[PDB]
Design a protein around this ligand. Structure first.
Ligand SMILES: N[C@@H](CCCC[N+](=O)[O-])C(=O)O
Ligand SMILES: N[C@@H](CCCC[N+](=O)[O-])C(=O)O
Ligand SMILES: N[C@@H](CCCC[N+](=O)[O-])C(=O)O
Ligand SMILES: O=C(O)CCC(=O)C(=O)O
Ligand SMILES: O=C(O)CCC(=O)C(=O)O
Ligand SMILES: [Mn+2]
Lengths: 226, 226
C-alpha cells in the first residue's frame, strides 16, 4: 500500500483512445477557477467482488457538494456538473491496487475530470483552497495530458507545518496516491510555458467508505449545513 | 479619528443620481467571484490642499495588482479592469474626514466599484480571501445599494483570533472605516432573500501613503514578484 510517509507516486498504463479527446468537451466549471477550469463529475460505488477484484457501479447523477471546512472557496453549495462521458475505471483500478483498499466493506468514489488552462499573464489555479484536505480517506490524482505548461507542482504537507515535506511536478502518465487524513496538499498554479495557451488535464478520485459516503440526501444536508 | 477598537461605522450623505445606475454597467469580474461579481476600478492621488481640504487626481488607468500574501485567490496577477465612470470622491471625502487622514504627506487610493449577485442556491462570495488584511493602512467599505439579499455580514477580527470581536450587516447608506493593519476582516456571503436574484453594490477604497503607493512599475513588480 501507501509508503511510510503516506503517499505513493505511480505510473499509469496506456489509456483508451477516447480519453484524451474527451477533455475538449468538458464545459466550463461555473464555480471554481474563474473561467480557467473545465469539468465533468461522476460518482461510483466500489464493491469488493468475487476473486480479488472490485466492481464499479456508476451512481445516479447528483450535484457535487462538499464542506466549507475543507474547501473555503467551493464548499457548502450545490455544484451542478455534467456527468463524465468516458470510462476512467481501468485507471482507477490501478490506484485501488496500489492502495490495497480495505476489502472488508464497500467504498464510494467521487471522480472529477478537470482541465485547467493557462495563458500568458493568466496562470491556471489548481488548488485555490490553499493547503487543504479534501475530507476523504484516500485521494488519487492522475495527470492525463499536459501541453505547454510550467508550474503545477504538487506539494505534500504535514498538518501544522510551515513548509511541504515533499514536492514534485506530476507529469502526463503519473498519479499520486495519498492519505488525505494524515497529509494535506496543494499544487502551484499552472503557468504558460512560452507565453501562449496551455492546459493540464487530470482526474481526481476521492475515496470514502460507503458507510461514510459523500453521496445522498444526508451527505448533501451536512455539506450544505441544512 | 477612528474608534478605540480600530473601526468606525458612518452614515453617508445622499449620492449623485448617476451613482446607483452605474452598477448596472459594470462588466463581469474575470478574476474573482466565479461569475457572481462585477467590477470597475480606478486609482487616485490624494494631496493636502489649501484651507484644510484634499485634492483628488485620477491616475492613468492601470491593471490592478495585489500580493498573494494578502489575497490568496486574486493576488500575484495582473487584473485588467475597466475604469470607474462615475465620481465617488465626495463619498470618499466623508471617509477622509472621519479618518482624520494625516496631512503631513500625500496619499494614494485604490477604488473598487463592486456588484455581487446572489440567487437561489448560489450565494455571492464577498471575501473569498477568508479573514484577511487588504494590505494597506486604512480601508473604507461603503454600501450603495442592496436588493433582495440576506447575509453579507461584516466581521472584524483581532489578528490571529479564532472569532471576530465585532459583527454587523452594513446597509445601503452605511460605510465602515478600518485600521487595515491592526484588524483583519471578512464578510459572510450574500444570500438570496427569497429564492430569486438579489445584489449588493459597494465601493471599496484602500488608502496608502503616496510613498508606499500601490501604483506604478515598482509596485507591480513587487506584487507580481518579478
Ligand atoms: N477540491 C476539488 C475536489 C477534489 C475532490 C474532493 N471531493 O471529491 O470531495 C474541488 O472542489 O473541485
Ligand atoms: N501618475 C503619476 C503620479 C501622479 C502625477 C505625477 N505627475 O505630476 O506627472 C505616477 O505614475 O506616479
Ligand atoms: N480584496 C479585493 C480588493 C480590496 C481592496 C484592496 N486593494 O485595493 O489592494 C479584491 O481582490 O478584489
Ligand atoms: O490539480 C491537482 O493536482 C490536484 C487538485 C486538488 O487537489 C483539488 O482540486 O482538490
Ligand atoms: O464586500 C465587502 O463588504 C468587503 C470586501 C473586502 O473586504 C475585500 O474585498 O478585501
Ligand atoms: Mn485536493
Amino acid at each position: 500500500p501507501l509508503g511510510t510517509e503516506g503517499f505513493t507516486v505511480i505510473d499509469l498504463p496506456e489509456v483508451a483512445p477516447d480519453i484524451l479527446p474527451s477533455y475538449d468537451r468538458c464545459p466550463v466549471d461555473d464555480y471554481m477557477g474563474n473561467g480557467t477550469r473545465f469539468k465533468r463529475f461522476s460518482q461510483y460505488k466500489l464493491t469488493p467482488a468475487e476473486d480479488d477484484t472490485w466492481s464499479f457501479k456508476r451512481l445516479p447523477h447528483r450535484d457535487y457538494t462538499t464542506y466549507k471546512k475543507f474547501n473555503p472557496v467551493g464548499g457548502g453549495i450545490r455544484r451542478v456538473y455534467e456527468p463524465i462521458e468516458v470510462d476512467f475505471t481501468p485507471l482507477i483500478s490501478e490506484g485501488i491496487r496500489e492502495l490495497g483498499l480495505d476489502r472488508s466493506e464497500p467504498w464510494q468514489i467521487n471522480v472529477h475530470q478537470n482541465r485547467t488552462r493557462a495563458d500568458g499573464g493568466r496562470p491556471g489555479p489548481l488548488t485555490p483552497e490553499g493547503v487543504h484536505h479534501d475530507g476523504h480517506e484516500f485521494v488519487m490524482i492522475a495527470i492525463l495530458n499536459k501541453v505547454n505548461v510550467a508550474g503545477g507542482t504538487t506539494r505534500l504537507w504535514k498538518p501544522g507545518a510551515d513548509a511541504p515535506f515533499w514536492s514534485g511536478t506530476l507529469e502526463a502518465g503519473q498519479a499520486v496516491l495519498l492519505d488525505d487524513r494524515g497529509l494535506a496538499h496543494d499544487v502551484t498554479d499552472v503557468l504558460s510555458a512560452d507565453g501562449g495557451p496551455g492546459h493540464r488535464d487530470i482526474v481526481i478520485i476521492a475515496f470514502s467508505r460507503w458507510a461514510e459516503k459523500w453521496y445522498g440526501d444526508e451527505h448533501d444536508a451536512a455539506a450544505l449545513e441544512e
